[PDB]
Amino acid sequence: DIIHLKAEQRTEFGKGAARRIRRDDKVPAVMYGHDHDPIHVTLDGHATLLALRTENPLLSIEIEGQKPMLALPKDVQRDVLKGFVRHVDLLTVRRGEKVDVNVALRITGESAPGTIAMTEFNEIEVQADLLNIPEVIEIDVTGLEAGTTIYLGDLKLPEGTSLLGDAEDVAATVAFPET
Amino acid sequence: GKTGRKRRARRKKGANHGKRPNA
Amino acid sequence: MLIPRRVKYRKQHHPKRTGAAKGGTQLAFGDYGIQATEGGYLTNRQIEAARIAMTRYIKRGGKVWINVYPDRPMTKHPAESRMGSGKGTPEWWIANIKPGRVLFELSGVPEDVAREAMRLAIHKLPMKARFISREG
Amino acid sequence: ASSSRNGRDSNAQRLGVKRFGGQLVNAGEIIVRQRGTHFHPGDGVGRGGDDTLFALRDGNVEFGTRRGRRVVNVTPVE
Amino acid sequence: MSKLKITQIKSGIATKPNHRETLRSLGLKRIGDTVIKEDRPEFRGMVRTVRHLVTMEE
RNA sequence: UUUCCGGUGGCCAUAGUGGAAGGGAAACACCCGGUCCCAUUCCGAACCCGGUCGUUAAGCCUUCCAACGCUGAUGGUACUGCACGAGGGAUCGUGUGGGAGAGUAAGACGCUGCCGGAAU
RNA sequence: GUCACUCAACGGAUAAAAGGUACCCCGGGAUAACAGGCUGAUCUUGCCCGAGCGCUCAUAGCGACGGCAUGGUUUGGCACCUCGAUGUCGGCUCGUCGCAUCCUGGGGCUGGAGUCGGUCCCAAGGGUUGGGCUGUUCGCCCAUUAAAGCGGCACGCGAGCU
RNA sequence: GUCGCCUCCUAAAGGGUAACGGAGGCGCCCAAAGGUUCCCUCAGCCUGGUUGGUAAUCAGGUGGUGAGUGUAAGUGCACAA
RNA sequence: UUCUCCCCGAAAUGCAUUUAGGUGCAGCGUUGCGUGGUUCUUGUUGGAGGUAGAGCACUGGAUGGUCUAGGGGGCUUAUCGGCUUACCGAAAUCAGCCAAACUCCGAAUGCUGGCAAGUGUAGCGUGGCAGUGAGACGGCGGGUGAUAAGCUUCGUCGUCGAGAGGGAAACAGCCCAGAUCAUCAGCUAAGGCCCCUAAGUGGUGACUCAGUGGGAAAGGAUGUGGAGUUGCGUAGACAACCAGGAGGUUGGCUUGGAAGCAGCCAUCCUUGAAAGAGUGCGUAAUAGCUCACUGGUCAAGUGAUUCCGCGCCGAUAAUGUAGCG
Numbered sequence A: 001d002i003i004h005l006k007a008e009q010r011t012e013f014g015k016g017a018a019r020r021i022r023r024d025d026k027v028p029a030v031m032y033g034h035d036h037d038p039i040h041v042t043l044d045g046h047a048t049l050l051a052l053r054t055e056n057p058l059l060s061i062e063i064e065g066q067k068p069m070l071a072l073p074k075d076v077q078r079d080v081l082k083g084f085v086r087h088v089d090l091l092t093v094r095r096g097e098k099v100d101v102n103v104a105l106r107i108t109g110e111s112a113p114g115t116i117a118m119t120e121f122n123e124i125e126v127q128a129d130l131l132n133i134p135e136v137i138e139i140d141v142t143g144l145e146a147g148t149t150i151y152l153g154d155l156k157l158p159e160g161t162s163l164l165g166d167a168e169d170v171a172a173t174v175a176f177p178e179t
Numbered sequence B: 001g002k003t004g005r006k007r008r009a010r011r012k013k014g015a016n017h018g019k020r021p022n023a
Numbered sequence C: 001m002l003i004p005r006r007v008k009y010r011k012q013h014h015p016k017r018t019g020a021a022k023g024g025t026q027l028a029f030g031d032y033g034i035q036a037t038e039g040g041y042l043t044n045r046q047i048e049a050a051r052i053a054m055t056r057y058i059k060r061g062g063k064v065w066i067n068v069y070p071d072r073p074m075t076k077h078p079a080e081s082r083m084g085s086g087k088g089t090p091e092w093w094i095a096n097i098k099p100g101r102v103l104f105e106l107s108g109v110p111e112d113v114a115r116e117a118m119r120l121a122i123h124k125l126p127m128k129a130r131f132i133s134r135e136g
Numbered sequence D: 001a002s003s004s005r006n007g008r009d010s011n012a013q014r015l016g017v018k019r020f021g022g023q024l025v026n027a028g029e030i031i032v033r034q035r036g037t038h039f040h041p042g043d044g045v046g047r048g049g050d051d052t053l054f055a056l057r058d059g060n061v062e063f064g065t066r067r068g069r070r071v072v073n074v075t076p077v078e
Numbered sequence E: 001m002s003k004l005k006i007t008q009i010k011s012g013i014a015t016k017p018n019h020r021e022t023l024r025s026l027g028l029k030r031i032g033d034t035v036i037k038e039d040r041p042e043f044r045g046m047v048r049t050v051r052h053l054v055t056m057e058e
Numbered sequence F: 001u002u003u004c005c006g007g008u009g010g011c012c013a014u015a016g017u018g019g020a021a022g023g024g025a026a027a028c029a030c031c032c033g034g035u036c037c038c039a040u041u042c043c044g045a046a047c048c049c050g051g052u053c054g055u056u057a058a059g060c061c062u063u064c065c066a067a068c069g070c071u072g073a074u075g076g077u078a079c080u081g082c083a084c085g086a087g088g089g090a091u092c093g094u095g096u097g098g099g100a101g102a103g104u105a106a107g108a109c110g111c112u113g114c115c116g117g118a119a120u
Numbered sequence G: 001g002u003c004a005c006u007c008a009a010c011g012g013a014u015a016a017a018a019g020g021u022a023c024c025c026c027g028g029g030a031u032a033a034c035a036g037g038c039u040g041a042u043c044u045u046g047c048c049c050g051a052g053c054g055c056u057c058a059u060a061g062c063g064a065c066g067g068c069a070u071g072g073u074u075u076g077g078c079a080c081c082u083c084g085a086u087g088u089c090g091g092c093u094c095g096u097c098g099c100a101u102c103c104u105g106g107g108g109c110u111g112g113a114g115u116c117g118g119u120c121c122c123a124a125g126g127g128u129u130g131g132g133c134u135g136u137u138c139g140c141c142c143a144u145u146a147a148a149g150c151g152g153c154a155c156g157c158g159a160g161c162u
Numbered sequence H: 001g002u003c004g005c006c007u008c009c010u011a012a013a014g015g016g017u018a019a020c021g022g023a024g025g026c027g028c029c030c031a032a033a034g035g036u037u038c039c040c041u042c043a044g045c046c047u048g049g050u051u052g053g054u055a056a057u058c059a060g061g062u063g064g065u066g067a068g069u070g071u072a073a074g075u076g077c078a079c080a081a
Numbered sequence I: 001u002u003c004u005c006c007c008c009g010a011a012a013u014g015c016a017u018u019u020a021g022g023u024g025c026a027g028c029g030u031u032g033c034g035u036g037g038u039u040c041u042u043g044u045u046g047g048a049g050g051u052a053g054a055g056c057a058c059u060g061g062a063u064g065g066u067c068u069a070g071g072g073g074g075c076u077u078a079u080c081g082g083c084u085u086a087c088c089g090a091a092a093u094c095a096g097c098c099a100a101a102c103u104c105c106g107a108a109u110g111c112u113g114g115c116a117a118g119u120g121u122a123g124c125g126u127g128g129c130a131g132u133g134a135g136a137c138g139g140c141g142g143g144u145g146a147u148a149a150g151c152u153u154c155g156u157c158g159u160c161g162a163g164a165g166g167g168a169a170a171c172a173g174c175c176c177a178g179a180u181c182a183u184c185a186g187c188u189a190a191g192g193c194c195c196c197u198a199a200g201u202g203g204u205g206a207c208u209c210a211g212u213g214g215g216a217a218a219g220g221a222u223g224u225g226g227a228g229u230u231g232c233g234u235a236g237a238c239a240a241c242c243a244g245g246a247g248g249u250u251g252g253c254u255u256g257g258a259a260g261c262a263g264c265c266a267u268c269c270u271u272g273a274a275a276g277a278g279u280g281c282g283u284a285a286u287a288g289c290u291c292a293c294u295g296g297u298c299a300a301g302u303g304a305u306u307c308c309g310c311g312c313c314g315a316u317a318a319u320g321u322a323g324c325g
């Protein structure tokens, strides 16, 4: 789904200007792409927070004077202790063009009670399409134990999402309990 | 001690702008 | 006890206690973490006490990671002695913790038992800490 | 008690750059005291026994690069 | 060139020696003393060096 | 004038490392000899000399590949000069100036001067 | 021109030199001993978490591993007043203050049946013995008592005594 | 315990900067380990080979500085110092 | 160490010292003569750097994963060799890290040149005369010490020293401000305006009920006001009141008793609108009261969770209230 974010132009740069913007419940953002210069905007803080709750969301940046622009938040500088978004990098995207993204990993398998499963990565590199961004990629490990290992070369990938990163590293590991 | 803590607390008064002799 | 195999210099200046965490502010090993919200010096005995608390609560399930190693030697002056006559010998091994540093990681355990185990472990540390997760 | 088994330091040697870029110097003026060739002698600059770099002629000091070496030159004054 | 009007509002006591020489260079001698300078970058730099000690107008 | 190429510099990876293909007119190069000048801590391998037969296989050169390496913004952040403020304290924040590193988008399969050769 | 120095306490008092002083003698609180001051490692008194012990049951009573503090009566750290003197240990005498309560007064919980207790909450009104040993403080012991409290006051108190 | 000299850190990106602060060195050595001229490239790794093995000596590939530098350490030096 | 006034006005640092409370030279004061913007501030334009920060390229330290040369223990049995490699595991590689004596990087400042403007009258040479060479505290950056000291030792700025006036209750070093004299004029700084005590018991809007204001920690808590995220809900939500609140099944290792409450466990099935091999009380052990849920009169909001502002407890010495003067 496409989340529409109202933005307005940013013309004051520096730590002081960003501090004032964040004190006005807003978020600084820079939107860069392929066929235009970087555009500096400021977004509503709470709307941006809700939109960035999900990961890899398709955003429609709406600036009053200009036309809407499609974007993906590539870098999100959040506060480490609190949760507030401090800065947004917005990579502009085309409707008829692929996008590289990082899709998330989880384990939903149920091994024998003694042995436990682990995930060895956070997000994985995936080439996919705009209107089809997979939420996550599941690896189900039920009854697979001992020293079994799972690498990135054989996963039930959805349609339209090829694999880009090196397929010679592990993403999940099942093993005995901790001794 | 009470005496030293009060000496170090006197620096928080209005007319001493966060500082005082001997802390 | 975590003590390095060897250190280049056994007498070192006190680590700086200024600034937010330089690195290791995001979970990288487990599914839940203890994140320090305050700075300080975390000794190896406190690390061990927290590790015992977590490991004993979670029992047999999952793994525990210690993201911080106490490789900083802190010297001790000879007892009842005046000042001078050189620096003391190392007595304590510390990790320099800054606000936002993930101290411990925990995985393979559901969220409520993980929360209780990390509450038990946090009550052993000398600084303030909080339970963090991977957005659920 | 005990004692300190350190305590010895050598005297200050006052090395470093003595004439910076664009400074007018006479022939024979020392531009930089240094150990080794952190700076190399360029055009109009000679190197001493203790690696001191001195002006071989009158002109203005400039710092630059010649091939792969970081050099000090003394460009003749116009 | 809008002929900056610079007036001294705080004293030079307990300020950095840089600030005191900046006040002297502006022609300011006392609190409340005023000078008229040309609108040139050096005088603006002097004003912003001691902005906690002076006020500027046009 | 131009094109290609042989030397000689400057920048010193945006230039390199790796891969694929192609080319030798003059030049280059391997190559063939060791009688002669000359040589190997043994060896005409190398250095040196006499040739230019054979060959573009390698060097060299032209083109293609972002693959490894290299270059790399904008914005933000850390830090910081000056002026302040907060906390019981480790320490923290703001105003006004300056402002990285990492990272991202991206660039990139070199740029350029002089001498010479062949053809034009 | 060159030579002769562990003149090494290395700008090198003489070519040439170790100690005792409680028999001692003639500026400094620039500097130590007592006391005050700061700090609070140590000490002390509490507390947080709760592994575990308590037949069962973390928390009646406890309380590993860790964490945070109080007080300022200990040993120290500092060297800030005093060296043209701030007399110091113990006791006697006279007290006065605190409460972190030993007795007596009131209460909650108990692994409180009763008689007795344990523990922590209030509470400083009054009380809180005489001897043996030792200069002692402290401590051990004897016979008691409702009890034989812990501390501060220049480790209260020598122009009050010893 | 120290006392003179040298190297590094503290030392806050010129120089300088203290403590009975943290590390080490020196009181030499070399007639070549000085001068000049010319030539050469290492350590490590892999493979093959009598004694010979991880490591003596030889051969091929790879390897740019991680070897070396009379002697501490730092700055340098592969254009090699 | 004895009269006066006028102008200027330090140092408590460096080096050396039979030196360390002394002295010499230098630094800082003054003054005669000489030279005059050479000094200083700001701007602008260059220069060298390796600190802050950051990073892991090197050197060390380090957590986990993948993989592995090689060591341990056993086996058929060892001259090999295989079964192990379920133990240890150098190195290689992936991910997250650490460093005063690490750096592929890298500021701000500071330092140093050119130029321009401004500028007190600054700077420099050379002579006469010095005093000083015990510093203190505060802000910022560090070493010693324990994340100590009104501690100690450096760098830098300020004040005191040698500085009065106003504020800080009093209070060298903190804040404002540098006293030529007179003034029974005015405006202000820091700080203040209910009274002491000059000026507002000022206007408007919020919050606190702790005398917080007018000291303190880990930690504990339905204090209070506000802002988000999320679950249930007139298909009727949560609390209260009426009936099913239990079958096989005293499921198991126990334990003369674990039948539902000793602990650990695969953590189901059923008459069925409905229930968990079991959550509290009870209890030598079983009974039982009663919880999650289903229908009913009623019925308009209830339950978590995050954050923010101001508060609560923790709180705790000795002459007398005594931590707003």
Ligand SMILES: CCC[C@@H]1C[C@@H](C(=O)N[C@@H]([C@H]2O[C@H](SC)[C@H](O)[C@@H](O)[C@H]2O)[C@H](C)Cl)N(C)C1
Residues within 6 Å of the ligand: G033, G034, G085, G086, G087, G088
């Ligand atoms: C450990 C003791 C410390 C010192 C003792 C004290 C002191 O000087 N006391 C004196 C003492 O001498 C006589 S009384 C015998 C004088 O009368 C008295 O005032 C005092 O000066 C003697 C040395 Cl005892 N000082 C002031 C401090």
Ligand SMILES: [Mg+2]
Residues within 6 Å of the ligand: C023
């Ligand atoms: Mg990182």
Ligand SMILES: [Mg+2]
Residues within 6 Å of the ligand: D048, D049, D050
């Ligand atoms: Mg030489």
Ligand SMILES: [Mg+2]
Residues within 6 Å of the ligand: D049
């Ligand atoms: Mg020499």
Ligand SMILES: [Mg+2]
Residues within 6 Å of the ligand: F072
């Ligand atoms: Mg970049």
Ligand SMILES: [Mg+2]
Residues within 6 Å of the ligand: none
């Ligand atoms: Mg930037």
Ligand SMILES: [Mg+2]
Residues within 6 Å of the ligand: none
């Ligand atoms: Mg950058």
Ligand SMILES: [Mg+2]
Residues within 6 Å of the ligand: none
């Ligand atoms: Mg001497």
Ligand SMILES: [Mg+2]
Residues within 6 Å of the ligand: G014
């Ligand atoms: Mg003599």
Ligand SMILES: [Mg+2]
Residues within 6 Å of the ligand: none
């Ligand atoms: Mg005498």
Ligand SMILES: [Mg+2]
Residues within 6 Å of the ligand: G029, G079
């Ligand atoms: Mg004194």
Ligand SMILES: [Mg+2]
Residues within 6 Å of the ligand: none
């Ligand atoms: Mg004392």
Ligand SMILES: [Mg+2]
Residues within 6 Å of the ligand: G036
């Ligand atoms: Mg006194």
Ligand SMILES: [Mg+2]
Residues within 6 Å of the ligand: B001, G040
């Ligand atoms: Mg205390």
Ligand SMILES: [Mg+2]
Residues within 6 Å of the ligand: none
């Ligand atoms: Mg002192």
Ligand SMILES: [Mg+2]
Residues within 6 Å of the ligand: none
């Ligand atoms: Mg007297």
